[model samples]
Target: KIELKYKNGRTNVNTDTIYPMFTIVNKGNQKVKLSNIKIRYYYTKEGNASETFWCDYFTKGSSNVIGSFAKLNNDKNNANSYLEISFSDAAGEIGAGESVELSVGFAKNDWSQYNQKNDYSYSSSTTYFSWNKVTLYVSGKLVFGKEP
Candidate 1:
């Protein structure tokens, strides 16, 4: 079993951070590589209303490796926005029975924004911060064991 606990970060370390993690198990015969994982962020927006969802999954980890971290804000009344915290290769490789820590949310507002463009500016482009880190994959079959 693999589990992670991170204290979301800001430009500083005292922000209202969230600790989100992925719990997985190694069930495959061979060790999972960093290039065999796949992750995608799903968000739906109608007019000015939007909803963001973060899903960590894999299809061909070694071929089309992928991993990510994301966040979504609900202004249900005016707008619904989804901010991809760290989408893609954020969390390094997941070995046979090992879990790793992804990226640290060490930025400012607007979601992962640290003095980029005021607090109202937002970024929707994919971030390539952890190209250095390997990818994550399911050892055999990774699923929600209980609840992290």
Candidate 2:
């Protein structure tokens, strides 16, 4: 079994930054690998095709995953556009009773939450509605060995 938890209100040197953060733990014995991670955030009133959300960072334990997180454009697959992440590097196995941490936030490089506004209220677009809760979905495969 796997456990997912959201830990909010976390900030770094850049107090300007904010994130939809969470943690994942592998409770089973077999080592698990994170294949695809999707986080869907809902706003009380926010949805503009021009609106974009860049990622802050994705880390495994203490290792930084480069180019692993990005915002899905066009949102062709679904109305609720989401932030997609790849953990192929640290997709490695966590101990039987160990866990992994994950975070999804704004775009930052030398600057944080720059040029972004979380205001305004209007009508619907595509199929997106209004709300305040963000949802996350993920799937992974268990690695045992090089089986034939």
Candidate 3:
């Protein structure tokens, strides 16, 4: 089984950028390939300005982390966009009871503030906790959390 833990890298939810940090843990007795895993963090695009994603830090090497933005078919639970996070084969694997941590964020080119009050995966809490709003997929199949 796989479990996910998340924490806000920034204490404030309303800011120019949103830090959605995550830790993916492998609970079952097997090695899970990182390349087959995909994580989606849901949020709203507050403006028309284009946004960019940043991989601030990652235990598996930031260069191995891949990020992309996609607009949802329909806005749901205060989310109109999602940041899809993936890893290259070079990221290696998560063995049983092992975990990988990553710090990621996104900001608009104009650096406008975001109102994350109603964002599905956003939390004002700075401490790590189990968050089901941010979904995880294995081989394109939902494996953890609820997707809005």
lDDT of each prediction vs. the true structure?
Answer: 0.31, 0.41, 0.87
lDDT of 1 by residue, 28-82 (tens): 5555544434322222233332322222333323223232334445544222322
Best by lDDT: 3
Candidate 2, lDDT over the whole model: 0.41
Residue-by-residue lDDT tens digits, candidate 2, 1-148: 5554554434342333345555565668766555454334422212333333434544554343322323334333222233333456455655667866665554333233322233111112323222223343446342211111
- Candidate 2 residues lying further than 4 Å off, grouped into runs, are 10-18, 36-79, 107-148
Task: Give Cα distance to truth, residue 110, candidate 2, Å.
Answer: 20
Candidate order (lDDT): 3, 2, 1
| TM-score between model 2 and native | 0.46
Clashing pairs in 2: none
Clashes per model (N, Cα, C within 3 A) = 15, 0, 0
